DNA sequence: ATCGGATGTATATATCTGACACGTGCCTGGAGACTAGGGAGTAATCCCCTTGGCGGTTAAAACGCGGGGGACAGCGCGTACGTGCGTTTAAGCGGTGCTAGAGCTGTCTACGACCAATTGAGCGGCCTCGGCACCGGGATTCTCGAT
DNA sequence: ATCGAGAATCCCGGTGCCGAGGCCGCTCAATTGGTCGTAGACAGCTCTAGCACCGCTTAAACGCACGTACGCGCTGTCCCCCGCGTTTTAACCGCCAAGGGGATTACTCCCTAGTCTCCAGGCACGTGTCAGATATATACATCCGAT
C-alpha cells in the first residue's frame, strides 16, 4: 500500500541524488529487500574496504523503524560480531520524517569516529579509547583480512 | 362543607409513615429500562442478573436519600423551608462530587 | 493559504492532505499519519521532536482538531485530487 | 558511609530533560515527583493485585494492569495511557 | 600438541597450543584462523573458565583434549 | 431494541417520596429536572465500572459481584449481596 | 525485538523496567508476576511522569523562572481538569491555591 | 491449654481459627504468617459481631419480634455512637433510615 | 457442584450465646456475612501494611494489635484489644 | 484632610496578596509547642523531627483553608459576606467530619 | 508539662488564613471555633503519628509517621517522604 | 378557650402459608508428626542530630478609637405549591416457552520460578559557577474626596 | 457622568550567595543461560437462569381547580468589625554544647513452611412447622371551625 509509494519515492530521490560514496539499491524483485554498498571513508583506517548491507523494511513504512545488517565483518566499536548495528536513530531516534539516505550517511560517519559512549563490546570500547594506535592497526589488519 | 386539612400537616404524616417503612420507593420496570438504556450506551448486548438490578436500585436509592437530608439542612440554613436546586448545587460542591 | 501545489502536500504522504489538522508546532501533514504516529511512533512531532501529548488531549475531548478554513481551500483550490482519494 | 536508598531521580531528569532541553528542577519538586510516581505505582499495582484475586488467578499479566488503568485514570487519561502501554508492550515482545 | 574446540554449534575447531603459550597469543591466533574476538570467547574445560594470565598446563590440558566455546554477545 | 428518553420513568412522585423520606417538608418544582440529572450522572459513574468489571472477565451478564465491587471501589460499601 | 541487551532500550522507555518488576514480584501483590506487566506499568509512569512535566515547564516558563519549583506543580495539576480529578485528595506541599475570589465579594 | 482439643476450642472462641489462618496464608497478604495472628483476628471478629449482634436483638425486642431483619440491624447500627462512626460508609439493604424531623418544619403554637 | 464457604454457623452459635430466643433470618445473615468479611478485610490488610513498614516479613499479633488500635474507635479499640490479648493468653497454654 | 481607605477595599488587596504567596502564615514556635503538648498528652517524654513538624503545619494550614473557602461558600449562599461560626458547622457537617 | 498554648494560634494567623481563603469579612466568634477545630484535627492525627511510632519500639516522631498517618486519614501529602 | 365532628392511627382476634430450624450423607479441608534453615532477637559500637540556652533586633502582636457599611427585624404582596377529586396508564403478578451462556471437566503445552556468574547502572561523595534572592531607583496604575 | 493628589505595585539594573548539575570511585543487583513443575487455554458437555410473550387486574400517575402562605423585595435601625496610629512583646537568627538514641554489624537460636498421612466439620439437600403478614372489627389520638 502506502508504503510501496514511499519506497518508490524514496528510489526517486536516491536516483536523481545519488549519495557520495554510498550507493543502495533493489537486491530482488521484492520491493522490500534492499543491498547498499558503502566505501571506506578517507579519513578512516577503512581505506579499500567495500561494505555491504542487506536492508529489511517492515510493513509500516517509515511508520516503523527499517532493519539493515551486515553482509561482511567490520571491526567497530558498535558493531557485533554477526553484523548487529547499534545506533539511537534505529530503535530510538526514528521518526517517519527521517529518510533512508541520511541512516547510510550515519553510518559512515559512525565508522569515521565511533560513538563511546554506549558500548557495543567493552572490549574493542578501551581497545579503541585507551590508546589510538592499538585500535588504528588492528583495524588496518581487519579491513585487509576480511575487505580484501 | 368538605373537610381539607391545611396545608402542612399531610406532608409530615408523610414524612413519619416514610421513615419508619423500609420499602424501595421507585418503580421496578422503569427504573430497569434505564440502567439497560445506560448499559447499552458503554456495550452492546448485555444481559443483567436480576441480583445487579436490584443492588444497583438499592445504592441509588440510598444516594438520592442523603442528598436530599444535605438540601434540606442547606435550606434550612438559608431560612427557608422549601427546598431549591441551588442547594442541592450548593451540596453537591461542599460534598467534592461536582469539582 | 498556499496556492502552491507542492508545499500543500503531506510531508510524509507526498500527496495531497484529507481533512487536515494543524499541530501546536505550526506544522501540517494528513490526520491519518498523526493516529498511525500516536498508536505507534513516539507521539511527538519529527522535526520539533517535543511531546504535544498535553495539547492533543485538550483538542481532542471537544473535536477541535478539525480545522474548517484549511479544509475549504484544498478542495476549492486542487478538487480532483480530493476526489480520487 | 549511609546506606543506599533508591530512587526515581535519574529516571524523571531524563523525562524532563526530553520534554524540555533547557530547564532544571529544584530538590523539593524532585521529591514531588518521587513521591506521586510512587502513589500511582501502589494504587495501579493494589487494584491489579485484587482485580486478579477476584478472577481467581494467580498471575498479573499485562491485561490486570490495563483494566487497572482503566479503572483508575480519568476518561482521557486512560484512553492515552492504554494507547502507551499498548504500543510500549508490543515494541519489547517484537 | 594438537587440540580440538568445539563451537555452540558443534562445529570443531584444531588448534595447535603448547603449555607454555600465553592465552593472549592464542585468542589472537584464533580470531585470525576464524574471526571470533579473542576476549568474547569463553573456555570451558572440565566445568572451570580459562584465566588470561593462566597457562596451558596450569590447568592440565592434555594432547586430544575438548574444549568448550562460548560466545558471550551483549547489545542488540 | 434499543431503548430512548427512559429517564422520564423516575416520575414526579416517586422523588417526591424519597425527597419526604429524607425529611422534606416543602418542595420547589426544578427539584424534577435536578434530581433527574444527578441521578442519571451517578448511575452512569456506576454502570461504567460495572461493565468495565464484567469485560474483564471474558463475560456477557453483569452479576450482583462486579455492582458491589464497583460501589466498594467508589467508596459506598453496600451489604445484603455477598463478599 | 531483538534480544540480549537492556530490556529499558528495548521498550524505548526511560523508567526502569527491571527494578518495576522485581517491585512488583516482591511487593506482596501476588504469587506470580508476568513478563510483560513490568513494561506496561513502566510506559504507563512515564506517561503520567511526561504529562505532568510538560504542564509545569510551561508554567515555569510563564512565570519567568528557568526551574521548577513546587509552586509551579500547584499550577499545573490544578489549572488542568484531568489531572485535578486524578488528584482529587492530594496536597502538595508549598503550592499555596490557585488566586480565585468570589464575585459577590468583589466592589461595585 | 491442654494441646488435645481444636484450636478454636483450645482457645476458647466460637470463630474458627484454622480458616482464619488459611485466609491469611493463602490472601496474599505477607510471605509468612505468625501462630498468634489468626486467633486474635478471630477474638476481634467474635467481639464485633456479638456486639453488633446483641444490640440488634435489643432492638427487635423493642419491637416486639422474634427475628432480627435488616431494618433493626440498621436501627441498632445507626442509634449505637462507636457502631456508627466505624460504618459510616455503609449501606445496608433494605434498612431505611432513622426517624428524625427538624425542629423547624414542626407545627406552630 | 462446588462448595462455598460462608461465617453463617458462627454467626448463629454467637447469637444463640447471646440471645437464647431470637431467630436471625435470611438476608440479615448474608449483611452478618459481609460485615465479617469487611472487617477481615480491613485488619488484614492494616496489618499487611505495617508488616511491611518496619522491613518485616511476617505478621506477628502484634502487628495485628497495632491495627486494631488504627482502625476502631476508643472505647471499641480498648475492647477489642482487651478480648485478643485474653484469647492469645489461654490459647498459648 | 487624612487619607483612609474605604472599609473593605484593603481586605481585597489582602486577598490577591495572600493567594500569589506560599510561604506558612502561622509562627513556627507556638504551633511547635502545641504539638509538643498534645503529643505529650498522649505520650511523654517524646522527641520531634523538624520535617515532622513541618509536615504538620503543611497539613494543618492545607485544612483550614479549605475548611475557610467552604465557610465562605455557605455565607455567600445564605446572602451575606460575613462568615459566622454556624456557616462552620454547616460545612463541617454536610463534610461529614461530625455528621 | 505545657499548658494553654492554643492561644499561640493568634487572631492575626487566623485572619490570615481567612484572606488567603477568600474571605473578605470575618465575625468576632470565629476564632474560638478555628482553635477549636484546629485543635481537634491535630489530636487525631497525632493520635495515629504516637501509634506508628510506638508499633515500631522507636522515641522520635520522624515525618515518614506523620505523612503515613495523613495517608490514612485520607489526606495524603506530598513532599517530606513516602 | 374548648367545644363536636371527622379523620386517621393503633389495638385485639382468627388464619394459613412459606421461610426458618433441624437431621442426614460424606468428602475435602483441617489436624498431627518431623525436618531444616533463614528471619528475628539480642549484645556492642558509632556519630547524627535534638534538646537546651544566651544575646539582640526587629517584625509582628496587642490595644484603642472613629465610623461607616452590613446584619437583622418588620411589613406587604402575589405568585407558586399543597390538597383533593375524577380519569387515564402501565406496573405487577401468574404462567408459559426457548436457549445463550455460566459453570464444570480433562489435556498438555508454554510461561514463569530458582539457581550461579558476572559485570555495568546507579548511588555516595565533592566541587564549582550561574540563577535567583535582594536592594535601590524610577515608572505605572488603582483609589477616593470633590466637582 | 469626571480632574487631581496620594499611595500601592510593577520594571529594571546591579551585587552577592549556595545548591544544582556534572564528575569520580565503587559495591550490588540485573542480565544471561539453563532446567523444571504447573497455570491456564482450549475443546466439549451440561442445564440455569435470563429473555421474550401473553392476559388480567387494580394501584399508582395525571391534569385540573382552588386557596393560601411564604419567598422576595423594600425600608429602617443600630452596632460592631475595619482601618490606622501607638505601644509592648517574643520570633527569629546565629551561636555554642552535650548526650540520647537511631542506625549499623555480628552472632545464635528457634519458628514456621513444607511434606505426608489420616479423619471429622461443615455443606448440599430434604423435611416439618409456627411467626408473621393479612383481613375484619373497635378504641382512641389528633386536626379544624368556632366559639
Ligand atoms: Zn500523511
Ligand atoms: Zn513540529
Redesign the pocket.
Same mark, same amino acid.
Given at each position: 500500500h502506502m508504503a510501496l509509494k514511499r519506497i518508490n519515492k524514496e528510489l526517486s530521490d536516491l536516483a536523481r541524488d545519488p549519495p557520495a560514496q554510498i550507493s543502495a539499491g533493489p537486491v530482488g524483485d521484492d520491493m522490500f529487500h534492499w543491498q547498499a554498498t558503502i566505501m571506506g571513508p578517507n579519513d578512516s583506517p577503512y581505506q579499500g574496504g567495500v561494505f555491504f548491507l542487506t536492508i529489511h523494511f517492515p510493513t509500516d513504512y517509515p511508520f516503523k523503524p527499517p532493519k539493515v545488517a551486515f553482509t561482511t565483518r567490520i571491526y567497530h566499536p558498535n558493531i557485533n560480531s554477526n553484523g548487529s548495528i547499534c545506533l539511537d536513530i534505529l530503535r530510538s531516534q526514528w521518526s517517519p520524517a527521517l529518510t533512508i539516505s541520511k541512516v547510510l550517511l550515519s553510518i559512515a560517519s559512525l565508522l569515521d569516529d565511533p560513538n563511546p559512549d554506549?558500548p557495543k563490546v567493552?572490549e574493542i570500547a578501551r581497545i579503541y579509547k585507551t590508546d589510538r594506535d592499538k585500535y588504528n592497526r588492528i583495524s588496518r589488519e581487519w579491513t585487509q583480512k576480511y575487505a580484501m | 362543607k !368538605?373537610? *381539607?386539612? #391545611?396545608?402542612? +400537616?399531610?406532608?409530615l #404524616?408523610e414524612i413519619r409513615?416514610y421513615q419508619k417503612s423500609t420499602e424501595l420507593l421507585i #418503580?421496578?420496570?422503569?427504573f430497569q429500562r434505564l440502567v439497560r438504556e445506560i448499559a447499552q450506551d458503554f456495550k452492546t448486548?448485555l *444481559?443483567? %442478573? @436480576? @441480583?445487579a438490578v436490584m443492588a444497583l436500585q438499592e445504592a441509588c436509592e440510598a444516594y438520592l436519600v442523603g442528598l436530599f437530608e444535605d438540601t434540606n439542612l442547606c435550606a434550612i440554613h438559608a431560612? #427557608?423551608?422549601?427546598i431549591?436546586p441551588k442547594d442541592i448545587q450548593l451540596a453537591r460542591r461542599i460534598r467534592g462530587e461536582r469539582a | 493559504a498556499i496556492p502552491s501545489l507542492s508545499e500543500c502536500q503531506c510531508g510524509i504522504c507526498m500527496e495531497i492532505l484529507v481533512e487536515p489538522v494543524t499541530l501546536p508546532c505550526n506544522h501540517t501533514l494528513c490526520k491519518p499519519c498523526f493516529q498511525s504516529t500516536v498508536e505507534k511512533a513516539s507521539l511527538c512531532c519529527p522535526f520539533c521532536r517535543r511531546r504535544v501529548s498535553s495539547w492533543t488531549r485538550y483538542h481532542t475531548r471537544r473535536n477541535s482538531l478539525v480545522n474548517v478554513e484549511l479544509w475549504t481551500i484544498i478542495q476549492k483550490h486542487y478538487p480532483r485530487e480530493c476526489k480520487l482519494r | 558511609? /549511609? @546506606? =543506599?536508598?533508591?530512587?526515581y531521580?535519574?529516571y524523571v531528569?531524563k523525562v524532563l530533560k526530553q520534554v524540555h532541553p533547557d530547564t532544571?528542577?529544584?530538590?523539593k519538586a524532585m521529591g514531588i515527583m518521587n513521591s506521586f510516581v510512587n502513589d500511582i505505582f501502589e494504587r495501579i499495582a493494589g487494584e491489579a493485585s485484587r482485580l486478579a484475586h477476584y478472577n481467581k =488467578?494467580? &498471575?498479573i +499479566?499485562s491485561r490486570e494492569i490495563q483494566t487497572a488503568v482503566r479503572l483508575l485514570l480519568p476518561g482521557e487519561l486512560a484512553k492515552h495511557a492504554v494507547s502507551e502501554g499498548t504500543k510500549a508492550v508490543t515494541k519489547y515482545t517484537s | 600438541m594438537q587440540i580440538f574446540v568445539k563451537t555452540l554449534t558443534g562445529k570443531t575447531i584444531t588448534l595447535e597450543v603448547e603449555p607454555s603459550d600465553t592465552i593472549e597469543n592464542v585468542k589472537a591466533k584464533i580470531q585470525d584462523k576464524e574471526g571470533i574476538p579473542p576476549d568474547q570467547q569463553r573456555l570451558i574445560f572440565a566445568g572451570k %573458565?580459562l584465566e588470561d594470565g593462566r597457562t596451558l598446563s596450569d590447568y592440565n590440558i592434555q594432547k586430544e583434549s575438548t574444549l568448550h566455546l562460548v560466545? /558471550?554477545? =551483549?547489545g542488540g | 431494541?434499543v431503548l430512548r428518553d427512559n429517564i422520564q420513568?423516575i &416520575?414526579? !412522585?416517586?422523588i417526591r417520596r424519597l425527597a419526604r423520606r429524607g425529611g422534606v417538608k416543602?418542595?420547589?418544582?426544578?427539584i424534577y429536572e435536578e434530581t433527574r440529572g444527578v441521578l442519571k450522572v451517578f448511575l452512569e459513574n456506576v454502570i461504567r465500572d460495572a461493565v468495565t468489571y464484567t469485560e474483564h472477565a471474558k463475560?456477557? &451478564?453483569v +452479576?450482583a459481584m462486579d455492582v458491589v465491587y464497583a460501589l466498594k471501589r467508589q467508596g459506598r460499601t453496600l451489604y445484603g449481596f455477598g463478599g | 525485538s531483538a534480544?540480549?541487551? &537492556?530490556?529499558?532500550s528495548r521498550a524505548g522507555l526511560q523508567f !526502569?523496567?527491571? /527494578?518495576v518488576?522485581?517491585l512488583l514480584?516482591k511487593g506482596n501483590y501476588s504469587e506470580?508476576?508476568?513478563?510483560?506487566a513490568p513494561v506496561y506499568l513502566a510506559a504507563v509512569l512515564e506517561y503520567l511522569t511526561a504529562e505532568i512535566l510538560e504542564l509545569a515547564g510551561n508554567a515555569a516558563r510563564d512565570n519567568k523562572? +528557568?526551574?521548577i519549583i513546587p509552586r509551579h506543580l500547584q499550577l499545573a495539576i490544578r489549572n488542568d481538569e484531568e489531572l485535578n480529578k486524578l488528584l482529587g485528595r492530594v496536597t502538595i506541599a508549598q503550592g499555596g491555591v490557585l488566586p480565585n475570589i468570589q464575585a459577590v465579594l468583589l466592589?461595585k
Open positions: 554506549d567493552p | !368538605p373537610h *381539607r386539612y #391545611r396545608p402542612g +400537616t399531610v406532608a #404524616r409513615r #418503580r421496578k420496570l422503569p448486548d *444481559r443483567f %442478573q @436480576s @441480583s431560612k #427557608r423551608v422549601t431549591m | - | 558511609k /549511609r @546506606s =543506599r536508598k533508591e530512587s531521580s535519574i531528569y532544571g528542577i529544584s530538590s =488467578r494467580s &498471575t +499479566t | %573458565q560466545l /558471550r554477545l =551483549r | 431494541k420513568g &416520575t414526579k !412522585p416517586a416543602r418542595i420547589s418544582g426544578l463475560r456477557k &451478564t +452479576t | 534480544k540480549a541487551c &537492556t530490556r529499558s !526502569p523496567v527491571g /527494578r518488576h522485581r514480584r506470580r508476576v508476568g513478563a510483560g523562572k +528557568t526551574r466592589p
